[PDB]
Coordinates of C-alpha atoms and ligand atoms in Angstrom, one line a residue:
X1 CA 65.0 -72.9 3.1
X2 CA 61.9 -73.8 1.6
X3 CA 59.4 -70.3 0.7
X4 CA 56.0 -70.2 0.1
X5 CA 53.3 -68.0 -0.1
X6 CA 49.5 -68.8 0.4
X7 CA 47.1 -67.2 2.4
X8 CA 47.7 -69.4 5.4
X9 CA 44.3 -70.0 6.4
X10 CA 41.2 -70.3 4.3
X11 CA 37.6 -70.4 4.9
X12 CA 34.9 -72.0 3.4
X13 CA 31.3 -73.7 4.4
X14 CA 29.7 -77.3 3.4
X15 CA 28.7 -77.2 -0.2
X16 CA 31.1 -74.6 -1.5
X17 CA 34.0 -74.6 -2.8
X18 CA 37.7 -73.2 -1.9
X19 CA 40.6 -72.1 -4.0
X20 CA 43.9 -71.7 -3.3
X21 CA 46.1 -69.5 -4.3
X22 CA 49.8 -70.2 -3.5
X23 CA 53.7 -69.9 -4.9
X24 CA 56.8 -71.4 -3.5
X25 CA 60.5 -71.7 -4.2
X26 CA 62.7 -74.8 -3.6
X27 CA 66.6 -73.9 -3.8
X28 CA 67.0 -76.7 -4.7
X29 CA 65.4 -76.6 -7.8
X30 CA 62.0 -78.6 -9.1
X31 CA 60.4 -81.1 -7.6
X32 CA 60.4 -84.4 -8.5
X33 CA 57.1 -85.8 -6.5
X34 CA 54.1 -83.8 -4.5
X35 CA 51.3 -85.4 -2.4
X36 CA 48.6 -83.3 -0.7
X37 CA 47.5 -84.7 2.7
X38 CA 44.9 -84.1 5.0
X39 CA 45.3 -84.4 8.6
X40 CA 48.6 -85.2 8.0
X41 CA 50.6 -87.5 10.9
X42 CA 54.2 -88.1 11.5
X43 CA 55.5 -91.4 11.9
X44 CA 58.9 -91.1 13.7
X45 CA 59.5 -94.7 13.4
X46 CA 59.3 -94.7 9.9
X47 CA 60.1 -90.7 9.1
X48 CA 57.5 -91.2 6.7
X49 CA 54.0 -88.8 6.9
X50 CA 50.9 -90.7 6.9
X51 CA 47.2 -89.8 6.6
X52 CA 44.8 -89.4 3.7
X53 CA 46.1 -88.8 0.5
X54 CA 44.2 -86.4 -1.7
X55 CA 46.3 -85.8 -4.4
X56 CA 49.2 -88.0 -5.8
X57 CA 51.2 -86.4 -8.9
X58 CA 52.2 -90.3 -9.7
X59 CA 48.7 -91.3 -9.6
X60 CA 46.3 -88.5 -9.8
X61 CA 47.9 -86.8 -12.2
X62 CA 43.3 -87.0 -15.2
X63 CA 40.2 -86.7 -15.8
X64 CA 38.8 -82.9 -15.4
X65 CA 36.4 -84.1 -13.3
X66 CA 38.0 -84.9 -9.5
X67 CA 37.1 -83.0 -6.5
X68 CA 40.2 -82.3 -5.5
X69 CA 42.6 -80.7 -8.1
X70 CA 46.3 -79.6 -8.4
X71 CA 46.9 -76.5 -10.4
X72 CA 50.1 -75.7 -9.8
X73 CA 53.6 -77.5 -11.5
X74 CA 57.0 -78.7 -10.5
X75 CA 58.8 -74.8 -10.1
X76 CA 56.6 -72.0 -8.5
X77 CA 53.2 -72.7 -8.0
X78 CA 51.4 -74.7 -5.5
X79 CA 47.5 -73.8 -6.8
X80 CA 44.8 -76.2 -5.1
X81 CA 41.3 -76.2 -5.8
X82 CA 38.5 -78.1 -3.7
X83 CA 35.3 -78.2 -5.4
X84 CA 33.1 -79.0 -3.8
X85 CA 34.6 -78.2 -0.5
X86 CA 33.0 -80.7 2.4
X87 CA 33.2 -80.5 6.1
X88 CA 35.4 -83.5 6.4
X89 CA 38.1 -81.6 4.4
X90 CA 38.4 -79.4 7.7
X91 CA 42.0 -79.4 9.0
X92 CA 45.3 -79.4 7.8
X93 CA 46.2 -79.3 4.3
X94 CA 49.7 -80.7 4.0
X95 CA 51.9 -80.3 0.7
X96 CA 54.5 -83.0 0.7
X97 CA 57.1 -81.7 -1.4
X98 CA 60.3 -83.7 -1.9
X99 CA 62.9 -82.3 -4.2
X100 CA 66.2 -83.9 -5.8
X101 CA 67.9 -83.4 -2.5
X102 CA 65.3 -82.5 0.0
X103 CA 61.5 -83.4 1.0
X104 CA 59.4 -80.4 2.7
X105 CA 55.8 -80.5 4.2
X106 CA 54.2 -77.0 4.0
X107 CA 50.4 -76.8 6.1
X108 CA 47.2 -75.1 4.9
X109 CA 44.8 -74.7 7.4
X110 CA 41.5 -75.2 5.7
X111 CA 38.0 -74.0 8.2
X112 CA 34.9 -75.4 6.5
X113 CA 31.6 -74.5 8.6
X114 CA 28.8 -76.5 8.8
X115 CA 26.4 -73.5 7.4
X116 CA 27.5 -70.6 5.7
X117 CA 29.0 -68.1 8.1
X118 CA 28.0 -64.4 8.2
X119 CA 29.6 -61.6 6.9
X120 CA 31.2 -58.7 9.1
X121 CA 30.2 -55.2 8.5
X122 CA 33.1 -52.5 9.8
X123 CA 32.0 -48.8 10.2
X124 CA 33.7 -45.8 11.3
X125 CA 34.0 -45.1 14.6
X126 CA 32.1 -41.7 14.6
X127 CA 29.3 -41.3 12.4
X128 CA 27.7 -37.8 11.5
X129 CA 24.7 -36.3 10.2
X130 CA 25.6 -34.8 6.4
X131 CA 28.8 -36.8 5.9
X132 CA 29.5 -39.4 3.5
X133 CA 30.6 -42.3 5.2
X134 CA 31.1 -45.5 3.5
X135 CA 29.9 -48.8 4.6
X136 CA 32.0 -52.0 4.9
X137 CA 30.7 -55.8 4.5
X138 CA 33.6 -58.0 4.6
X139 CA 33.5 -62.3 4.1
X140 CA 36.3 -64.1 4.3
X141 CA 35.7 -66.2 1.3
X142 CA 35.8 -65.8 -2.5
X143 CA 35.8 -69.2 -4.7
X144 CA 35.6 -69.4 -8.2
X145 CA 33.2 -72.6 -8.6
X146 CA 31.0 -70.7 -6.1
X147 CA 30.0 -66.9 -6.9
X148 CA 27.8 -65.0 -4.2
X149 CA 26.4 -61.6 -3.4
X150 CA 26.2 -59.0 -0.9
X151 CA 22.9 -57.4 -0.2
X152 CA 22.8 -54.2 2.1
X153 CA 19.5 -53.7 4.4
X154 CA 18.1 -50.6 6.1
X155 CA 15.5 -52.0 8.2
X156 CA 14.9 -54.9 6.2
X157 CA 14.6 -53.1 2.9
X158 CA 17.4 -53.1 0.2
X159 CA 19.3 -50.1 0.1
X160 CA 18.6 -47.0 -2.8
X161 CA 22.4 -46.5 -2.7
X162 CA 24.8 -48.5 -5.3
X163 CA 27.3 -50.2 -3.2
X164 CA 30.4 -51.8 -4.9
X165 CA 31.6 -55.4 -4.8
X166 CA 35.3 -56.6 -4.9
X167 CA 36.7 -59.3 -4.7
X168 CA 40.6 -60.6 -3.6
X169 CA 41.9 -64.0 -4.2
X170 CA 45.6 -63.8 -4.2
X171 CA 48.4 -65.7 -2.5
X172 CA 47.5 -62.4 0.6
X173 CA 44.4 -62.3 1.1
X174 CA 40.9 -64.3 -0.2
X175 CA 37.7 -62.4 0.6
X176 CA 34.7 -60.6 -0.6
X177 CA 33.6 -56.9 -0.4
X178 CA 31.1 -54.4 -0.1
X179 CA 31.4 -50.7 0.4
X180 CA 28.5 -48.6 0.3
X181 CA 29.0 -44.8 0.4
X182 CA 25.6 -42.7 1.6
X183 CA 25.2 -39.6 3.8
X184 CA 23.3 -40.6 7.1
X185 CA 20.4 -38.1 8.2
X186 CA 19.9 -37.9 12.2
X187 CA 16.5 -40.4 11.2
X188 CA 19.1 -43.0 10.5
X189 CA 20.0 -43.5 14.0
X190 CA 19.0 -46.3 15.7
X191 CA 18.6 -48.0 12.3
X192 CA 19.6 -51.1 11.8
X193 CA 22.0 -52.0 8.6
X194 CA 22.3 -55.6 7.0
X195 CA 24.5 -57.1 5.2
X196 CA 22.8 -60.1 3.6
X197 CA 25.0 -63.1 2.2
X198 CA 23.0 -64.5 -0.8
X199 CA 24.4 -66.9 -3.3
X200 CA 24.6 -66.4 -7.2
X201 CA 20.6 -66.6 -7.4
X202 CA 19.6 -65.1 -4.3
X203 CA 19.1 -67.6 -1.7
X204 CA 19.6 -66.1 1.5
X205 CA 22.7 -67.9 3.1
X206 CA 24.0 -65.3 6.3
X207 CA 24.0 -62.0 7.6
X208 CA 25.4 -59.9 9.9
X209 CA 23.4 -56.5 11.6
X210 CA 24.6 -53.6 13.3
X211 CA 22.5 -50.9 14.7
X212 CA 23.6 -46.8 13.5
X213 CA 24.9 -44.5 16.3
X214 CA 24.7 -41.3 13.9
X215 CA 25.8 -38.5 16.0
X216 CA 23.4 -35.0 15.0
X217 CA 23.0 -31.8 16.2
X218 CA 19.7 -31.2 18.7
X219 CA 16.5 -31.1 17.0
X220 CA 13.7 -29.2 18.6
X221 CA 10.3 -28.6 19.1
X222 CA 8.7 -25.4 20.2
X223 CA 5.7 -24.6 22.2
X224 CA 4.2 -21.5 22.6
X225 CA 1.0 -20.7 25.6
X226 CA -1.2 -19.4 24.6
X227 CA -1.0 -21.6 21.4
X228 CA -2.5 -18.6 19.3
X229 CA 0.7 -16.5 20.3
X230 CA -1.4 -13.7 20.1
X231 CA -2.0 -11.4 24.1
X232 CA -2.8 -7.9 24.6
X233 CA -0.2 -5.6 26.6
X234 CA 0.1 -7.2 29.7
X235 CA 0.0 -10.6 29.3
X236 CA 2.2 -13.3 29.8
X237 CA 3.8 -15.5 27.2
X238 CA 5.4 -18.7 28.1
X239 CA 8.1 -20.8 25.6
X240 CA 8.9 -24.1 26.2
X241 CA 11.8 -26.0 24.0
X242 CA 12.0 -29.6 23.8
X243 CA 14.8 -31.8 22.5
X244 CA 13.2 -34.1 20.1
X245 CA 16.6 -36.0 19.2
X246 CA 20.0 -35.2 20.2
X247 CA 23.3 -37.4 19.8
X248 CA 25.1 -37.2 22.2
X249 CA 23.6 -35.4 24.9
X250 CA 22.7 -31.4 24.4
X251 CA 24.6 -29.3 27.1
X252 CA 23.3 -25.7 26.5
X253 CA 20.4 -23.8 25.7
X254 CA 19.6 -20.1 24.6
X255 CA 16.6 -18.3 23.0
X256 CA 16.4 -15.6 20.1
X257 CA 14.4 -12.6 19.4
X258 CA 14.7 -11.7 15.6
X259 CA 17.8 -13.0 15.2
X260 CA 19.6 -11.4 18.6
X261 CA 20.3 -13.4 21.2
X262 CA 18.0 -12.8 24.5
X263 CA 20.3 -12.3 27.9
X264 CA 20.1 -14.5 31.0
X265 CA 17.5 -16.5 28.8
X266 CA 19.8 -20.1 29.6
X267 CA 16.8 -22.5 30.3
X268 CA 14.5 -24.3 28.1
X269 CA 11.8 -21.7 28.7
X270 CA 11.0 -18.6 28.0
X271 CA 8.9 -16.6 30.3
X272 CA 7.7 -13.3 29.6
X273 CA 6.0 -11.2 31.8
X274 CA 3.8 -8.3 31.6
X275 CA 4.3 -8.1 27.5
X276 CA 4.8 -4.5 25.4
X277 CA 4.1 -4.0 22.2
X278 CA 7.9 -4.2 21.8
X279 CA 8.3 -7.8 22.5
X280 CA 6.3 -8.8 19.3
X281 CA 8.5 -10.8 16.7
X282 CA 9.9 -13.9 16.2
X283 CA 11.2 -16.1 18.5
X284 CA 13.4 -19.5 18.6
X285 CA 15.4 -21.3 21.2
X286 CA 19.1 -23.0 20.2
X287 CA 20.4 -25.8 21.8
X288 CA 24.0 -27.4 21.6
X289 CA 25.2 -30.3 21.9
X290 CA 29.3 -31.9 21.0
X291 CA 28.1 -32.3 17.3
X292 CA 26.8 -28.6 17.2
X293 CA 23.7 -26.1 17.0
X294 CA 20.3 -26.8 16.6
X295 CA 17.4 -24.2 16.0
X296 CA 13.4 -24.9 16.6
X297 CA 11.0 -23.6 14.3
X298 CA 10.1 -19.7 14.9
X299 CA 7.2 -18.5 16.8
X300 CA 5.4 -14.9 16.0
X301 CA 4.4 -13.6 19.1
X302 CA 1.4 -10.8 18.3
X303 CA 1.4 -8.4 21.0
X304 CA -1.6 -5.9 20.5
X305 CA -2.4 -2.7 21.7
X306 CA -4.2 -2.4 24.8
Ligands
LIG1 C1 49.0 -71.9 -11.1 O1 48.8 -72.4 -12.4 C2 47.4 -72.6 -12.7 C3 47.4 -73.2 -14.0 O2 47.6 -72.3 -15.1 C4 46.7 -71.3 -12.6 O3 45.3 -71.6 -12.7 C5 44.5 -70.7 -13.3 O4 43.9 -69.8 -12.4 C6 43.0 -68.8 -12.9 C7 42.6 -67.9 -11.8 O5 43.8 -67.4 -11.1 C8 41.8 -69.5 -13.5 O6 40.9 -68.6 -14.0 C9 39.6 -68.8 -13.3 O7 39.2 -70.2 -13.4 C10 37.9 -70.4 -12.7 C11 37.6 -71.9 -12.9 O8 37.1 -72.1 -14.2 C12 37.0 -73.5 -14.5 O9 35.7 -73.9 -14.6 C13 34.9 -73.1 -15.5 C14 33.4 -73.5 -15.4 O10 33.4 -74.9 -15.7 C15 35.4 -73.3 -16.9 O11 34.7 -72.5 -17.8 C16 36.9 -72.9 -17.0 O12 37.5 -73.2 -18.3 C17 37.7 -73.6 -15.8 O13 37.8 -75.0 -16.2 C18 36.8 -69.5 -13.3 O14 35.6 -69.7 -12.6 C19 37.3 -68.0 -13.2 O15 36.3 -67.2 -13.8 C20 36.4 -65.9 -13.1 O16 37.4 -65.1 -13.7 C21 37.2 -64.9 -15.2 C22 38.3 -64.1 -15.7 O17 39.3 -65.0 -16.1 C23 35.8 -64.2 -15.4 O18 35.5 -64.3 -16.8 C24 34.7 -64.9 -14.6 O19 33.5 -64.2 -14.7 C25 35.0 -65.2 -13.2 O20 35.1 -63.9 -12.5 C26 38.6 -67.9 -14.0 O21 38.4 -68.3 -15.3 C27 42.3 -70.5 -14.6 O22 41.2 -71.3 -15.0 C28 43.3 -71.4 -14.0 N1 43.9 -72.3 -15.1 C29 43.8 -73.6 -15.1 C30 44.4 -74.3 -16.3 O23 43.3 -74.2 -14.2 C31 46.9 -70.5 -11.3 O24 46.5 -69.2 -11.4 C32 48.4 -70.5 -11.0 N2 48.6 -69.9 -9.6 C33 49.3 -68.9 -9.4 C34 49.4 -68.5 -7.9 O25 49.9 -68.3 -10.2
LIG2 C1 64.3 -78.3 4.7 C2 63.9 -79.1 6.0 O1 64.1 -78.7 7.0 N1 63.1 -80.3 5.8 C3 62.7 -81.1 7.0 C4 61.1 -80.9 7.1 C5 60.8 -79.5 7.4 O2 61.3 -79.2 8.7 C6 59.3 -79.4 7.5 O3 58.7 -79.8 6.2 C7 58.9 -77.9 7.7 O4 57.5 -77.9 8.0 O5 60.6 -81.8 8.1 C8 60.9 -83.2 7.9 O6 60.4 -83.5 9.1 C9 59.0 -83.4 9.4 C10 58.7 -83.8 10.8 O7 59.7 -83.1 11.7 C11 59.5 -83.4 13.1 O8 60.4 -82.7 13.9 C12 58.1 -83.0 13.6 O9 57.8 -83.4 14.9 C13 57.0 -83.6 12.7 O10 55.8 -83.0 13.0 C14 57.3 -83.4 11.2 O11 57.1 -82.0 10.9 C15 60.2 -83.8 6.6 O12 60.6 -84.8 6.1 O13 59.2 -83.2 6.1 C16 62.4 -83.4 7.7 C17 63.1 -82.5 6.8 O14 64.5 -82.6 6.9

């Protein structure tokens, strides 16, 4: 029973570099030699593993500068550092551990892209006007030797808000983070959000985009004929309201005279007939939609004498 703890897979992309966090514990006690293959094979003939050799306590272990170092020691630590990390180191990772008694191969799978790959942005959900909803940009890579950034983009222009970066790089979990907290408007629907991967001095690397679905109540437009909204007694006056933007779809529709609710008025226009003096005031349509209520702007409607 040989236990160890590593994050199991890492991820990485030509030219940067990958560190390894990882503890173990041999019951049988400390080990006595370690080799760190790549692409280990099995030779059953022989029961021996061969392969490249990238790390051999008799022989590498220096000189402070090797690409390949081990950071760990002969009890509970298993450390490995690649710096730089190359495209050829893509595979398995295989510590060959061998204790007094008994020899144990443990495998890190190690993914090295060609080009830097992007970042992954995860939102709620259900996004509404007026709340504070925070952003996420997740990568799955964090290496010492190789510090980047996070940049968020609202159609291509950096963001006002401050968005905070953390990073994990623990025997769990490696990655880097972004959360950005800001209120979306109804305007930010539609809008597209980036999350730009930049390295220590800027240079644009990756980036991932998603497009806002902000859910708002319906805004309106109002339109009064005549424009003037000023008739004599007798005329006719007719309203229209027009959804302007409206997430999701609006499903009902009322109109309002001085703040009281106008019956059997259920259509996006208002007609009225043969006007009084008594219909003068100011009037405003309502529309509905899952989110809630939207009003238009009011109209004053100048009914003269005669
Ligand atoms: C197994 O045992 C080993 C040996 O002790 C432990 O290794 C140490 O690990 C820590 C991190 O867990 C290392 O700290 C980090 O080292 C990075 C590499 O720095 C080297 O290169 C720079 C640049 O040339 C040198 O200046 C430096 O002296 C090293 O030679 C740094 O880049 C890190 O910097 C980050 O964190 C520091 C905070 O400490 C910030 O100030 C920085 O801004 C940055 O955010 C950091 O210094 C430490 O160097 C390792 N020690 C050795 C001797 O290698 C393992 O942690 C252990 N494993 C487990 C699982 O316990
Ligand atoms: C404690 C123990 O079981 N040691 C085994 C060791 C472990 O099973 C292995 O390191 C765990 O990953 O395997 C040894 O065999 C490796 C060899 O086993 C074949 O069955 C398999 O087809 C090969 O791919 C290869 O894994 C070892 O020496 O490492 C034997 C040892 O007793």
């Amino acid at each position: 029973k040989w236990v160890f703890e590593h994050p199991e897979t890492l991820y990485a992309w030509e030219g940067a570099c990958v560190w390894i966090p990882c503890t173990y514990r041999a019951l049988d006690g400390d080990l006595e030699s370690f080799i760190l293959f790549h692409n280990p094979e099995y030779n059953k003939a022989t029961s021996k593993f061969d392969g490249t050799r990238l790390y051999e306590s008799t022989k590498d272990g220096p000189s402070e500068q090797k690409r390949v170092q081990f950071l760990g020691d002969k009890n509970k630590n298993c450390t490995l550092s690649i710096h730089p990390v190359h495209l050829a180191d893509s595979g398995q990772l295989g510590l060959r551990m061998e204790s007094k008694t008994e020899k144990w191969m443990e495998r890190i799978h190690l993914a090295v892209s060609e080009r830097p790959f992007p970042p992954h942005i995860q939102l709620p959900p259900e996004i509404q006007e007026s709340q504070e909803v925070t952003l996420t940009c997740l990568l799955a890579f964090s290496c010492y030797g190789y510090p980047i950034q996070l940049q968020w983009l609202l159609e291509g222009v950096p963001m006002r808000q401050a968005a905070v970066t953390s990073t994990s790089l623990t025997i769990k979990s490696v990655f880097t983070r972004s959360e950005l907290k800001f209120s979306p408007q109804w305007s930010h629907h539609g809008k597209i959000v980036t999350c730009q991967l930049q390295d220590a001095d800027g240079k644009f690397l990756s980036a991932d985009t998603v497009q806002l679905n902000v859910k708002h109540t319906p805004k309106l437009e109002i339109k009064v004929t005549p424009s003037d909204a000023i008739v004599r007694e007798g005329d006719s006056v007719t309203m229209t309201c027009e959804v302007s933007s409206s997430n999701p779809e609006y499903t009902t529709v009322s109109w309002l005279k001085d703040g009281t609710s106008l019956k059997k008025q259920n259509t996006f226009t208002l007609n009225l007939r043969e006007v009084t003096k008594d219909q003068s005031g100011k009037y405003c349509c309502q529309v509905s939609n899952d989110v809630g209520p939207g009003r238009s702007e009011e109209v004053f409607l100048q009914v003269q004498y005669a």
